[PDB]
């Protein structure tokens, strides 16, 4: 969950798996994503009004950005720890 | 370490398996932590304990854990009074002396 | 149980009743007999929804008028919860009366939530779902397939099966929640959306969101079908002003203007091609516009305009098209030069705060565009898009944005303000200009609602102060009151934490978010609370960027590593799907006793609608007061409008909005008087805001807890969780905290 | 590098380094000469 | 180029002194330096290749809009609306005749914009402004 910085050396042998680790992270969302009940359907709450065009939320209500406007990667660690929590929970969902 | 309610309940299920049908199968848990880590699903273990007619009474130490309350409610046929939490020394002694009586 | 209020029999679906519920029914029945607007604040935790539904259904059935019930909630999830409670209530009523009476109850939402079509199901945007369903169900596809059976266009079989059966035969009588309606329509191969949208005039009660009553882009069709004497319930209406402002607001960016230029060029190419092929399909539209027919006359009932009407229908002009935009090419040139004027206004180096009148005068003197042709821009654009019969509509969405902007800024001049900021975000290196047309007056959107309906029941669990809203929204209340729950034992223990363990004052001001002392105090507090909370924790932050910074540096300083030893950490992502997965993961981890902590925005998606009852609550760790970004221009303009028009102070309004967001965060922890959970508020500035809390939270907040540090807050929380882990005495709560039927009869006799 | 700004063009060069830059005392504990160690730092 | 002046061939980058000077007769991206070069001595033909229209220095102006076609449409609308200025008060509240007048003025503006009937429309607007 640490923020990755380009100044760190890493390890050239291990870092070849970084793209394939991101591929595994993408594959982990495949069997984790499933329709939920309407009681906690937060996706459908923002889709209740699809043609809403109100004022755009400010930068406090939005994820952080760099000087160039690109993502600073702090949401990546949030998605990573949420994925880790989901993986721990779905590991209990087995035949054991 | 870090307690495992599912491992304890599975081992209790294994130990209470050769118990004859006339003998009542009961599990007393002196649980102190507020969170537990399980290798697998604990609701399957709860269903297996209910199917094996095992009544679980849990003596909590810190607060009312929801999984222990649900386990006591399911294993005691909807009775929520089998999840006991102490208050002090004397309440702990009274709760320990309450469990010697047959259910 | 079954009991009587005055002459009204009430079938409460529970064998026991809270006293606050009975007082709530008494107040609602008094309001409905008088026939006025009211603001009623029950405490959260008590059965507000079941009380509302029970009394309103009893009033509708027993009294002969059978007044329709409009239960306007804030989110679709709360709509589904109200539908579930209504289903339980009608099951109890059927059991008690021995029969299922003639009754219809449905929930109304968008096509995305009610699309059983397997093709257009995986689309992540509601707009493309609407446009694909419209493409398959405009009737143009149906007549094209009727004239040409070999045409490549297809029809939605769920929509087509509804033509076989009547409107009254769409569903069996009763109440259909979204899950049950989706299952039934999947079994019978029907579209649930068009079933709901056609039965609005037939439903005794219809439950939809505030957007379907306040936003005129979608409330135009809904408000015609509903009865004008119906009972209207505003549930959780403490943020109804945000919906009112968002209804009549629009933000334009330079990318939107570029896509508008591209769409105008594409529209010019399309009108040139159609004029080359067939000018009759334009000539008939032109002569119909000469006759004075509007969009409602030209468009059929089963089709919808391409550009939704962005303004109130009472503010729409009744006279014909002026003629500057009557011809298709003339309107295309008009729209193109309007977009070019917007691009010219977009290029500026500072912020302009100008009224719509000044903008219209500048546009007229520089472009010769008048206000009256601008007022017909959306209708003319929708008619042109219909008559062009374009298959693709993806290139004309920015044209919808431009038409919405033009109609909004032409029809409205008072209570609105146009803000052009050279920097949308200050963190960007290259400037990104943005044009914001905001709505300063929140009463504009809700004004026709109070005109149309005589009796409106505004209700939230955490609406406080009650008198703020009649000043904010121009309506009169016959009676307003806030209940405090009667408890045998103090079910919830709020405290205000003003300092850390080392007595260092803690605050969540955005400028001091990088202070290691405050972040260390918050991390130690969160670690101790995760150590002492049994089931789960929900943590609320003033802003998502504050969460991002503080969680990143918590993981840098290793606080979260200590948190992982006890509770799983789940964070509200900006993606709604991943947030829903995180929320159900949180509920699963709280259910099995693994223990979980949820980090959410106090103004985010999780803060509205989502409830944390029993094990899902147990602690609301509020990191700081959820103030808005103070120096944002929209908020400052709204504050100036509130000060000038209603004499509401800027600091008072900011404190009120932040405190009501904090209150709605605290109201999610309780459901039922058996439920318990602490409400800890980690900022130094809550201590003066005890009076701005809701009345019941103020009663629950002792005076000794107003300036706690971390350590005695932890000790009090441990003592509290040990205290109500004990079984309560039934004799201590037999007739003081919860009533049986006999207790209700005794109180009824004691009142008279 | 300081006259490009005078003409409106942005220079990538900062101004160069031409414009504007900058006992042993006596011992009494003679029975532990060499047993004690020097500590010039904490 | 939208940034560079083809007549004098100077970038905005190393020469930020160029300006968006255009001519109503023929809209060309020509800087102020080229305008003060060519047309200060006298009227001349358009320095853009393929065009030879006569044009004056005092008729030069800056372009408000980025689009050339929108700019020339707005300029033609300005050249028409000065003499074509009947209002609803001029029509004594006749809404239908006012809409017909709006259609007619938009049609002649379109005709002047595309030049399809420039001679007849020009003669008509001369005869209208002579009153
Ligand atoms: S008619 Fe219903 S099921 Fe068919 S595409 Fe439209 S919303 Fe989906
Ligand atoms: Zn010097
Ligand atoms: Zn030049
Ligand atoms: Zn030329």
Curated annotation (Swiss-Prot), chain C:
The keyword Protein biosynthesis appears for this protein: no
Enzyme Commission identifier(s): 5.6.2.3
Keyword terms of this UniProt record: 4Fe-4S, ATP-binding, DNA damage, DNA repair, DNA-binding, Helicase, Hydrolase, Iron, Iron-sulfur, Isomerase, Metal-binding, Nucleotide-binding, Nucleus, Transcription, Transcription regulation
Gene null: resulting phenotype: Essential, it cannot be deleted.
Activity dependence on pH, as recorded: Optimum pH is 5.6 for both helicase and ATPase activites, suggesting they are coupled.
Motif, DEAH box: chain positions: 235-238
Top EC group: isomerase
PROSITE patterns: DEAH_ATP_HELICASE, HELICASE_ATP_BIND_2
GO biological process assignments: nucleotide-excision repair; positive regulation of mitotic recombination; regulation of mitotic recombination; transcription by RNA polymerase II; transcription initiation at RNA polymerase II promoter
Catalytic activity: Couples ATP hydrolysis with the unwinding of duplex DNA at the replication fork by translocating in the 5'-3' direction. This creates two antiparallel DNA single strands (ssDNA). The leading ssDNA polymer is the template for DNA polymerase III holoenzyme which synthesizes a continuous strand; ATP + H2O = ADP + phosphate + H(+)
Cellular compartment(s): Nucleus
Cofactors, names only: [4Fe-4S] cluster; Mg(2+)
GO molecular function: 4 iron, 4 sulfur cluster binding; 5'-3' DNA helicase activity; ATP binding; ATP hydrolysis activity; ATP-dependent activity, acting on DNA; damaged DNA binding; DNA helicase activity; metal ion binding
UniProt binding sites for ATP: 42-49
Effect of substituting residue 115 to S: Extremely UV-sensitive
Cofactor binding note from Swiss-Prot or TrEMBL: Binds 1 [4Fe-4S] cluster. ssDNA-dependent ATPase activity requires Mg(2+); Mn(2+) can partially replace Mg(2+).
Domain Helicase ATP-binding, residue spans: 7-285
Residues spanning the membrane: none
UniProt-annotated binding residues for [4Fe-4S] cluster: 115, 133, 156, 191
Primary localization: nucleus
Gene3D superfamilies membership: 1.10.275.40, Bacterial XPD DNA helicase, FeS cluster domain (1.10.30.20), P-loop containing nucleotide triphosphate hydrolases (3.40.50.300)
Other comments on record: Present with 14400 molecules/cell in log phase SD medium.
Oligomer and partners: Component of the 7-subunit TFIIH core complex composed of XPB/SSL2, XPD/RAD3, SSL1, TFB1, TFB2, TFB4 and TFB5, which is active in NER. The core complex associates with the 3-subunit CTD-kinase module TFIIK composed of CCL1, KIN28 and TFB3 to form the 10-subunit holoenzyme (holo-TFIIH) active in transcription. An additionnal subunit, TFB6, plays a role in the dissociation of the SSL2 helicase from TFIIH after transcription initiation.
Family (UniProt): Belongs to the helicase family. RAD3/XPD subfamily.
This protein's name: General transcription and DNA repair factor IIH helicase subunit XPD/RAD3
Species annotation: Saccharomyces cerevisiae (strain ATCC 204508 / S288c) (Baker's yeast)
UniProtKB/Swiss-Prot annotation, chain D:
Family to which the UniProt record says this protein belongs: Belongs to the TFIIE beta subunit family.
Note: Present with 1150 molecules/cell in log phase SD medium.
Protein name: Transcription initiation factor IIE subunit beta
Disulfide bonds: none
Subcellular location: Nucleus
Subunit structure of this chain's protein: TFIIE is a tetramer of two alpha (TFA1) and two beta (TFA2) subunits.
Function summary: Recruits TFIIH to the initiation complex and stimulates the RNA polymerase II C-terminal domain kinase and DNA-dependent ATPase activities of TFIIH. Both TFIIH and TFIIE are required for promoter clearance by RNA polymerase.
Superkingdom of this protein's organism: Eukaryota
Signal peptide region: none
Organism: Saccharomyces cerevisiae (strain ATCC 204508 / S288c)
